[PDB]
Paper text:
The precursor PdDfsB is cleaved by subtilisin to yield biologically active Slf, and the chemical gradients of both proteins between two growing colonies could be accurately modelled. However, remarkably, the dfsB gene is widely distributed across Gram-positive and to some extent Gram-negative bacterial kingdoms (PFAM entry DUF1706). PdDfsB adopts a four-helical bundle core structure that belongs to the DinB structural superfamily. The most strongly conserved region of PdDfsB is the C-terminal helix, which is present within the mature Slf sequence.
We were able to express, purify and obtain crystal structures for DfsB homologues from Clostridium difficile 630 and Escherichia coli UTI89, as well as of IRC4 from S. cerevisiae. For the purposes of clarity, we refer to the first two proteins as CdDfsB and EcDfsB, respectively; however, we have no evidence that they are truly acting as DfsB homologues by undergoing cleavage and release of their analogous Slf “toxin”. The overall structures of CdDfsB, EcDfsB and IRC4 are identical with that of PdDfsB, with strong conservation of overall topology and surface charge, particularly in the C-terminal helix. We solved the crystal structure of a S. agalactiae DfsB dimer (SaDfsB) by molecular replacement using a pruned CdDfsB structure as the search model.
Numbering used by the authors: 13 to 183
The structure:
């Protein structure tokens, strides 16, 4: 999706995040690690995936501003190693409760609003304004807002569909 301005991007993040996070309210902690064949991840893994990617995007931006060399997706994993990165997200966050994961994700979304407001329009909406954005997709050219959309709005919709499917079968 193309966004015309900062307020449009922030609004869509807020709208899709609120719908996504609300789906976890009715899931008891005792079932946060329950896997079924019909849906890929557990509820805790579903949240951990979002905490994982939002933490990384925020870190790329912070490190680049801090004058560090950003290796994307991370220092330990390459772009053809995402499956292993996802296992690392699960190992690193999924042992948390749903309440703790929701709180952490909410903090990252608030930080993403600050990240957006701290960028100039040019830095947010034009190519080649961040080294980490050029580094994260070397086959194509992606603007910062596109990385934000693809790591918030898009998965907040698709992973919402997963958790709803999971809830209909399990609860």
């Amino acid at each position: 999706r193309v966004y015309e301005n900062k307020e449009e991007l922030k609004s869509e993040i807020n709208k899709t995040f609120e719908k996504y996070i609300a789906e976890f309210d009715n899931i008891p902690e005792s079932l946060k690690d329950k896997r079924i064949d019909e849906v890929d991840r557990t509820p805790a893994e579903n949240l951990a995936y979002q905490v994982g990617w939002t933490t990384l995007v925020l870190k790329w931006e912070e490190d680049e501003r801090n004058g560090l060399q950003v290796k994307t997706p991370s220092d330990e994993f390459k772009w053809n190693q995402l499956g292993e990165l996802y296992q690392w997200f699960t190992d690193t966050y999924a042992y948390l409760s749903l309440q703790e994961l929701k709180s952490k994700l909410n903090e990252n979304i608030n930080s993403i609003y600050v990240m957006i407001d701290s960028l100039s329009d040019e830095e947010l909406f034009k190519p080649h304004m961040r080294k980490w954005a050029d580094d994260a997709t070397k086959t194509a050219v992606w603007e910062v807002y596109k990385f934000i959309h693809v790591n918030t709005v898009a998965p907040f919709k698709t992973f919402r569909n997963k958790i709803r499917k999971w809830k209909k079968i399990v609860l």
